[PDB]
Amino acid sequence: MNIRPLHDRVIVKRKEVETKSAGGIVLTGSAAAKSTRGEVLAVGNGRILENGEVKPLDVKVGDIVIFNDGYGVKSEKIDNEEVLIMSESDILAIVEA
Amino acid sequence: MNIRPLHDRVIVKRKEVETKSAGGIVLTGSAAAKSTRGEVLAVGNGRILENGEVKPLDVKVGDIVIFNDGYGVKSEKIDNEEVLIMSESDILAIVEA
Amino acid sequence: MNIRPLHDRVIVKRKEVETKSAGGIVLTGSAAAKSTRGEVLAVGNGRILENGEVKPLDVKVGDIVIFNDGYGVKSEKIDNEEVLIMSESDILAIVEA
Amino acid sequence: ISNIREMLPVLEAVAKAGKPLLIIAEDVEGEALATLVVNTMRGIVKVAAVKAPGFGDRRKAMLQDIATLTGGTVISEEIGMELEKATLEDLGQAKRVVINKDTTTIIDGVGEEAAIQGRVAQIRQQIEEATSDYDREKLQERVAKLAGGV
Amino acid sequence: ANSDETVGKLIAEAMDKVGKEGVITVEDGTGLQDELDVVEGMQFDRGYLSPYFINKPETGAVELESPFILLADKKISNIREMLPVLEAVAKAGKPLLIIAEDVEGEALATLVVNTMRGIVKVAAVKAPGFGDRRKAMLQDIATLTGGTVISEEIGMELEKATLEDLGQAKRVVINKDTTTIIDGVGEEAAIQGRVAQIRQQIEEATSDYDREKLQERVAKLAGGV
Amino acid sequence: SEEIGMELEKATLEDLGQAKRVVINKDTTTIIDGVGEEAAIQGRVAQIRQQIEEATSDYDREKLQERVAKLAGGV
């Protein structure tokens, strides 16, 4: 037992804070670039909006994702390590192309 | 693998910042005209609003488009290059006439 | 190719700024009367609100219209000339009587 | 001159005609000045920009006198002339213009001599009405710049 | 000097080294004995921005061998402007001297991280004086280095500069007070055209106090102070 | 420090110096006998001493003399 996302909810680890060697060259100082890239840890059941039969979420555990660092997006420790909790809709995207 | 738009979401490249030779004549200085024209890079599945059967988005990859530079419209690097992420409804239009 | 309105969207040319000879008599100075009258240029498909079968918009190309100069109403160049982009509902009316 | 956004159709028109240009206005904003520098430097239009002389009513009067000399029109809000609605017929012309860090000088207008004399006669009549001797001298300079020399 | 032979010979020697363009100045001396200090090349009275750049701590100072020099108008707000130039210079491999009117904390701290850990060898210094004479002296510095002054007025983004748009010198040396540059890459004929422009404005100089400041600018470009 | 780009959160026990004893009062702090290498101390003393020879302010030259004295010798 950790704790489990509800309906419409996803849990992810933020990849980095700052991709520190800029371009692959310059070693950046304090830039504040909390990474837009996350990676999926848990996925909460399905979406239970709209009364009828429950829809599976289109994200899955193992996915590498991008999300909005918005008001809805929360962060807390799994064990002792910070991970982020949000809705499928505060997520923007999953590994294409 | 890049990362992929969700349901109702579209990814586009902004064409220019400033159409620099005004009218085709005058070479404009600092005007701040971040172009209203984009061009489609990826299209996220369909729209999953309203419970029932999923609707395909009416935009497609290869399209040249106009969008609102609004609150909903986000921007981030594909590889090292900035591209813009938004809903079908924050998009205004696709190449008519 | 110009660019095309989405679902629920309409494109129009604003008729005048200032109907300059007031009453047909007095030649008005700087009054700021950006005309409430527009004329239709393009009409985006139909309205795709509410899941089921798609409804045609009740406006058409060639129509002379009145709209609200509100927050929703955007303006941009077709070729080099400013025209206005909005929803069917930010439009108020089409040529009666 | 707040923006190049006002300036555009005149800039298109003058560049297309091909002649150099002198911009008189009460001030020029950073966007406007920087854009003019980009156009001159890279060769699109040959343009000089200078500030209007003195202040208030005598600045307005001297700008009309400058227009009478050049054979041009003064663009103002009072006449209801948008900068955006000016054309190349609405610009005066001179044979040569020369400008320094301190001083501006214009050599030999296109303005009609009879119009110049009508405007000189107006200015001269107000000399005969001049209660302030200090300002009468300033009226004497305006007659002298239009006709004769200082 | 009322029959003071030492004063006479010191001035004869100084006029010797500085040249006709060169300016000789008088200051309170450190000791009982008179001394003469002659500097050739482009020296000006602005120090190193941070002490972390010190690559000669036994000289108390920074020395950079064959550097590119970047001249910028206004403030360096971020490394976000700096990036493509930083990538380009690092990839080329040469040391670098940053001239700008100021450097912001994010920019200065990032430069310290890169120098300290060895990625790029970079010194940062502040522009001399204020207003129009700072702008003029920055053009003179660019003429000496054989470089381009990056400014908003010319419409040059810092982000759109390239390595062709940077001047160069044989050596640069910098202290806590003073900056000095040894032997430009700027073309001698261009230097003389710019000297001739500056010299012509000496002949126009109503303020004698500012005429001296014009004399220093001619002297720094050609001759010594 | 921030200038070197060192987060307090990213420091380790290798990045802390050490002394044999430390003693502290309501006014005064004193440290007895460092772990710092003597050659490094002398290089840093030599840097400080060279700036004494450059010191235009006699008042601040005394303050440079105290820094040399605290590092080597006593006050």
Author numbering:
A (entry chain Ba), B (entry chain Bv), C (entry chain Bh): 1 to 97
D (entry chain Bu): 227 to 376
E (entry chain Az): 152 to 376
F (entry chain Al): 302 to 376
Per the authors:
The GroEL–GroES chaperonin complex is a bacterial protein folding system, functioning in an ATP-dependent manner. Each of the GroEL subunits consists of three domains: apical, which is designed to bind non-native proteins and co-chaperonin GroES, intermediate and equatorial with an ATP-binding pocket. In addition, 7 subunits of co-chaperonin GroES with a molecular weight of 10 kDa each form a dome-shaped complex that is able to bind to the apical domains of GroEL, closing the hydrophobic cavity.
After additional refinement, we have solved two major classes with different orientations of the apical domains in the trans ring. The estimated resolution was 4.0 Å (C1)/3.4 Å (C7) and 4.24 Å (C1)/3.4 Å (C7) for the “wide” and “tight” states, respectively. At this resolution, we can conclude with confidence that the subunits of both rings contain nucleotides in the nucleotide-binding pockets, most likely corresponding to ADP. The assessment shows almost no difference between nucleotide-binding pockets of the cis rings of the tight and wide conformations. At this level, it is not possible to find out whether one of our two structures coincided with the structure of EMD-1046. We propose that such complexes appear under low ATP:ADP ratios, which precludes the substitution of the ADP for the ATP in the trans ring and the subsequent release of GroES from the cis ring.
